[PDB]
Ligand binder design. Structure first.
Ligand SMILES: O=C(Nc1cccc(C(=O)O)c1)Nc1cccc(-c2ccccc2)c1
Ligand SMILES: O=C(Nc1cccc(C(=O)O)c1)Nc1cccc(-c2ccccc2)c1
Ligand SMILES: *Cc1c(COP(=O)(O)O)cnc(C)c1O
Ligand SMILES: *Cc1c(COP(=O)(O)O)cnc(C)c1O
Lengths: 306, 316
């Protein structure tokens, strides 16, 4: 039971109980359990959940006759999707050009450069909006370049509808809540549609810091915006208490999941809350979030622009 | 794949065929196949193979009655073993103190600290030996303080005898060669013993740094030190690999197979490719399993992964 390619060693990620951070691991006289379960999407080829949509988008574009050998793929990305696409591009014989905001971490730049991706740096003030606009123009100018367009490509949502969701349901049939970051919206749209088909009364909860064409607000039951200090606090808590060295979006997710769990606890409801760990902490070390005390980390955040 | 504890989501790592890098993936008229298979030990809780010996050493100490609630583990390490023990100790309710020389890099320190290790800095001038002597002395002060000593602890070897080896035999029954780095020697000793017991004519091959180059190799072990775990009869061959070759191999691995590996993996691959070239020249069939002990992440600051391989290959 083995692989012929790194591309097959993707998905089927572990789901791990957070016995210490869970509001109440054990059912007892105070009330039923309120458990958190972490889906470890860092156990993927390039260490993030984006391997799932990146590979599916390329393979869907290949099946649709859109890609020839030595073709250039052009993608607007804040990093993880670019890295995933860079890895798949190396394996499959394509060139990759990423359009990224200029204020992305040094680690993301390093990984992209190592895989041989080229980078266009669009204005920080314009964010993902300007990155996308810039990629669109370049793609119009260069019709042979293939823009997969993670923000609107249904193979993104499909990768979660066919992978993340089925896996979660098999590991956690008692699931009551799924919590994840809301970026491209692929994870929540695909996983959330799958869960809603299969599980009566399941709740689909977004955490977050133009509107992607993938987004359907009807799939979400709740949406929470999380500040940088709370995301950092939670990220640190996760590695200190549960030994899971996660990226900062996972702290945002954990903040949201702990808010949901506190709500279940107060209502004496049973809850089994799955949350996405989208990547590990390696690419975020240069932020200072993991060093020293929380006091130090909060101080280190002053002046940073992500 | 549901686990109540992170400690259970350890081992059973993937084995990936390297079709592009292999000397000859398909059998045929030119001769039998010579295939490389990469064992991805970065798919472990802390991203390295050391999660195996670390957890097993703690569990064996527990079983032996050496570790009770509130105990402190002591280990002279600034590396992957310290990271792994920090994670595992924290999860099982123990304190960890890592003993290391005063001049240890801040990078290594930060990875240990974020997993909750405490650190005692032994005298810079004495290097590794003084760290080990200090850890021993500290452990001897207090029945609650226990040194595991990864270079001599048979639970290090046993983690591979009971995990890595069996997993390889299960995924690659046709295995002819196993290649890994030679550090504590746990990987090669335990996996090698296991495979030798089950596979006729299996070859166990070490990769290691050249003499006088352990520093560039990113390990703090002394030159003429022989781990108590080491048994030279287990090995068929040893490849001493230079720093430039290790870095080149690390890059070829990422470029041809997409695997972002740590530096020791480059040395391992160099060795495996040598073994492979020998099997090819002798028209023998080979299925060569090699260890990816960790991923590239913690080595980004070395400059070994810079876009230009010509600059990167001298970075160590
Ligand atoms: O949505 C993303 N990442 C994302 C979005 C779209 C594209 C990509 C990409 O890799 O190209 C990444 N991250 C995310 C999601 C949810 C919460 C947070 C977050 C919130 C507060 C502090 C830090 C991060 C960050
Ligand atoms: O043995 C190790 N690392 C090691 C040993 C014992 C403990 C630890 C640890 O991080 O805890 C690491 N590395 C290794 C093994 C084999 C070859 C190489 C190598 C050789 C040439 C250039 C670069 C690395 C490096
Ligand atoms: C992409 C990503 C998210 C959000 O997932 P989407 O499916 O794009 O909504 C969250 N965290 C990290 C680290 C990501 O890369
Ligand atoms: C430990 C280690 C080795 C050597 O393995 P041993 O089992 O200690 O011989 C090689 N590379 C890395 C990255 C390691 O952590």
């Amino acid at each position: 039971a083995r692989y012929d390619s790194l591309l097959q060693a993707l998905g089927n990620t572990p789901l791990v109980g957070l016995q210490r951070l869970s509001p109440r691991w054990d059912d007892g006289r105070d009330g039923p359990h309120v458990r958190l379960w972490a889906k470890l999407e860092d156990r993927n080829p390039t260490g993030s959940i984006k391997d799932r949509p990146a590979v599916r988008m390329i393979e869907q574009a290949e099946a649709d006759g859109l890609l020839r050998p030595g073709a250039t793929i052009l993608e607007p990305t804040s990093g993880n999707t670019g890295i995933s696409l860079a890895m798949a591009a190396r394996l499959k014989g394509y060139r990759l050009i990423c359009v990224m905001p200029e204020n992305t971490s040094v680690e993301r730049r390093q990984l992209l450069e190592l895989y041989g991706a080229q980078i266009i740096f669009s204005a920080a003030e314009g964010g993902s909006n300007t990155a996308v606009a810039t990629a669109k123009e370049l793609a119009a100018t260069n019709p042979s370049w293939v823009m997969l367009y993670q923000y609107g490509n249904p193979a993104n949502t499909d990768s979660h509808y066919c992978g993340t969701g089925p896996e979660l349901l098999a590991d956690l049939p008692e699931i009551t809540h799924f919590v994840a970051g809301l970026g491209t919206t692929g994870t929540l749209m695909g996983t959330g549609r799958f869960l809603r088909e299969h599980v009566a009364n399941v709740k689909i909860v977004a955490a977050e810091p133009f509107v992607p064409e993938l987004y359907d607000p009807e799939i979400l039951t709740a949406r929470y915006s999380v500040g940088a200090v709370d995301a950092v606090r939670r990220t640190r808590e996760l590695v200190h208490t549960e030994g899971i060295f996660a990226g900062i979006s996972t702290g945002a997710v954990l903040h949201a999941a702990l808010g949901v769990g506190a709500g279940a606890l107060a209502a004496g409801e049973r809850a089994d809350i799955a949350l996405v760990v989208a990547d590990a902490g390696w690419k975020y070390l240069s932020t200072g979030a993991y060093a020293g005390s929380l006091d130090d980390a909060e101080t280190a955040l002053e002046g940073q622009l992500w």
